Amino acid sequence: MGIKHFSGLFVLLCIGFGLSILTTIGEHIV
Amino acid sequence: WTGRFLMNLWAIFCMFCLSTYTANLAAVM
Amino acid sequence: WTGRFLMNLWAIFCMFCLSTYTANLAAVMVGEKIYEELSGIHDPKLHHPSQGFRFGTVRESSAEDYVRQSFPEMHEYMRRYNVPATPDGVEYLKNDPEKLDAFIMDKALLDYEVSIDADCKLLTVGKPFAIEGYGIGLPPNSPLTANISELISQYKSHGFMDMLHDKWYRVVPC
Amino acid sequence: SARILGMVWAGFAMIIVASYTANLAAFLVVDRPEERITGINDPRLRNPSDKFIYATVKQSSVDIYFRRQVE
Amino acid sequence: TLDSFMQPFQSTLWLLVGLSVHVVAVMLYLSARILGMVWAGFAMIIVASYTANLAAFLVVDRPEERITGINDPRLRNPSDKFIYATVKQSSVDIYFRRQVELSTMYRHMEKHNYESAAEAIQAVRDNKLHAFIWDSAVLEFEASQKCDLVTTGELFFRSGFGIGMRKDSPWKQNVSLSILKSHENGFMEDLDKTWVRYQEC
Numbered sequence: 323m324g325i326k327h328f329s330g331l332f333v334l335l336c337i338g339f340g341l342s343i344l345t346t347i348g349e350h351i352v
Numbered sequence: 353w354t355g356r357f358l359m360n361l362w363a364i365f366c367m368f369c370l371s372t373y374t375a376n377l378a379a380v381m
Numbered sequence: 382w383t384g385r386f387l388m389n390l391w392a393i394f395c396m397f398c399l400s401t402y403t404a405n406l407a408a409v410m411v412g413e414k415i416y417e418e419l420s421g422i423h424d425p426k427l428h429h430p431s432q433g434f435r436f437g438t439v440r441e442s443s444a445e446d447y448v449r450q451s452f453p454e455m456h457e458y459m460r461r462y463n464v465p466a467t468p469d470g471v472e473y474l475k476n477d478p479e480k481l482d483a484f485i486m487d488k489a490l491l492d493y494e495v496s497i498d499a500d501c502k503l504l505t506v507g508k509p510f511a512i513e514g515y516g517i518g519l520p521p522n523s524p525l526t527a528n529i530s531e532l533i534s535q536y537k538s539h540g541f542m543d544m545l546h547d548k549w550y551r552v553v554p555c
Numbered sequence: 556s557a558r559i560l561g562m563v564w565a566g567f568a569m570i571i572v573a574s575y576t577a578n579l580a581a582f583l584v585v586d587r588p589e590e591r592i593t594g595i596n597d598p599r600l601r602n603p604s605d606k607f608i609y610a611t612v613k614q615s616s617v618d619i620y621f622r623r624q625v626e
Numbered sequence: 627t628l629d630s631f632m633q634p635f636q637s638t639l640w641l642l643v644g645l646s647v648h649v650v651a652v653m654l655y656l657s658a659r660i661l662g663m664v665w666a667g668f669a670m671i672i673v674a675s676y677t678a679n680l681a682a683f684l685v686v687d688r689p690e691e692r693i694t695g696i697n698d699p700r701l702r703n704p705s706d707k708f709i710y711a712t713v714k715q716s717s718v719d720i721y722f723r724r725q726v727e728l729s730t731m732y733r734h735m736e737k738h739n740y741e742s743a744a745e746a747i748q749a750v751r752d753n754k755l756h757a758f759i760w761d762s763a764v765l766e767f768e769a770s771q772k773c774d775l776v777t778t779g780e781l782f783f784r785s786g787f788g789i790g791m792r793k794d795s796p797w798k799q800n801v802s803l804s805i806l807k808s809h810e811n812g813f814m815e816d817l818d819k820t821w822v823r824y825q826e827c
Contacts, residue, residue: 324675328639331671332646335664342657371576374674375583381682396673399573400680404628406577407684410585423819451812499598510815548626553598580681 419483422510427483430458436483437462439470443487447511468494475502487513493550501555634683636676643672693757695780704734710757713746714739718759721783735759743768750775763822773827 419426427436438445440463449456462481464470471494474481484491488509495503517533519526536542592599599607611617650665693700700708712718712735722732738755740746747768749755758765762781769777789805791798808814 324679327675328642328672331668332642335646335661335668336649338664339653339657339661342660343653346657367572370670370674371579374576374678375580377675377678378580378681379583381678400677401628402570402573403577403677403681404684406574407581407681410577410581411685422815447810447812497602499602511812512809512814551596551601553596553601555598576677577681580678584685 416504417506419506421507428452430455434483435462435479435481436485437464437470437481438485439463439467440465443513444485448485471503475500489515496550496552499553499555628684630683634679639672639676693779696782702731708756709734709738709754710759711735711739711746711749711755712759713743714741716760718761747772767822770824770827 422428427434436459438448438459445459445463448459464473464481467486467490470481470484470486474484475498488505492505495505517529519529594600611621646668647665650661653661701710704710712722714736719735722728722735740749743760743764746758746760750758751772751774766777769775789801791801
């Protein structure tokens with residue numbers, strides 16, 4: 323399950339980074 | 353003082369939790 | 382450059398050391414079985430005295446008379462270590478504190494008296510030396526001096542001792 | 556000597572933490588008491604103790620048969 | 627010992643960690659606090675997982691090698707990695723054609739088989755077979771001089787090397803008397819020390 327957990331962690335990290343970038347872009351003009 | 357004590361307590365709790373998690377992961381292996 | 386190389390070397394060394402320590406601890410906690418070790422009869426552990434051990438036997442019994450008159454240097458080094466009976470002997474060693482630490486007595490009784498003690502604290506050690514053999518003693522030339530002989534030979538050859546020897550010397554894992 | 560003492564103390568703390576973690580993991584792996592009694596040939600069911608007083612209703616079917624076996 | 631670090635396929639984990647670190651650096655270059663916290667947590671979790679996996683791998687060691695007895699599990703269905711050879715045309719073959727239960731056992735002993743002790747014990751060194759079945763004293767001796775292979779296992783099928791004598795021969799008793807009086811008087815042990823066991827091993 324180690325590979326599965328690592329893939330899940332990577333997916334969660336990517337989603338979090340994308341959401342943070344979008345929020346920062348939105349608040350930059352806000 | 354208060355902040356240092358709170359940080360130390362949080363560190364101790366986190367270390368205990370990490371040890372417990374590692375032990376559980378080893379046990380489930 | 383130099384700082385990055387130093388940091389990388391330090392981190393790699395710390396990680397490898399932590400992994401090695403974890404492996405060593407796993408090996409140390411994953412198994413342990415040592416006890417003592419005796420090679421045989423000739424080992425200087427008892428053949429060469431070392432400040433007064435116990436290694437007792439059974440007074441005037443079967444197997445003491447061997448060391449009575451084959452290694453005639455150390456009978457005084459038994460004398461104060463011979464409790465009379467067998468079973469009180471075998472418990473005289475287990476109920477620590479230490480009172481005795483080795484024991485010389487015929488094999489069969491020993492191998493029985495290790496196999497009803499689930500505490501598993503005991504074990505046969507070393508390789509056999511010398512020999513004896515049990516038997517049935519009869520008066521001076523009674524008529525049944527051979528009928529028993531042929532009969533018991535037939536019994537043994539038949540496959541009858543196996544039934545018994547299974548029935549009693551049960552080997553249960555501790 | 557402050558820097559050297561601090562580095563040594565940090566190393567000692569890390570070593571203590573690693574040893575504690577190793578012991579905890581080993582203890583967690585070890586714990587497995589279970590082992591219910593099984594049958595007619597068991598170390599628990601071959602010798603007496605005080606923690607295993609087992610009985611049977613007296614003078615009844617079982618107890619009579621369960622007495623003749625000299626073995 | 628501790629050498630199979632790369633055998634554990636740690637290369638894939640190292641490559642994944644490197645790619646994730648590069649991705650984190652790119653994202654921080656392109657909010658940085660959240661990504662840094664995520665990377666630190668991932669590093670700690672990966673460290674814990676690597677330690678746990680290393681401990682689990684250290685637990686496994688493929689123990690219980692060698693052999694225990696004649697009724698132990700391995701000696702009842704030899705697949706291809708325990709082709710043990712007796713010494714056909716001996717007493718041993720006869721004793722494996724008269725014990726009924728051992729039938730299946732015997733069958734595979736009539737696969738690859740030898741015609742002398744010498745080539746056999748040599749082949750033990752040649753590392754093809756992983757056993758041998760042949761009487762006691764010869765075995766312990768051979769193990770002693772050619773200190774290459776250690777005896778093992780228990781004993782079975784007991785017996786005794788008597789001294790044979792013709793039926794109701796004139797000396798039918800006195801040899802028995804002398805052999806007993808010696809056999810307790812520390813003689814056989816002396817001879818056994820001086821002839822049957824050596825200490826080069």
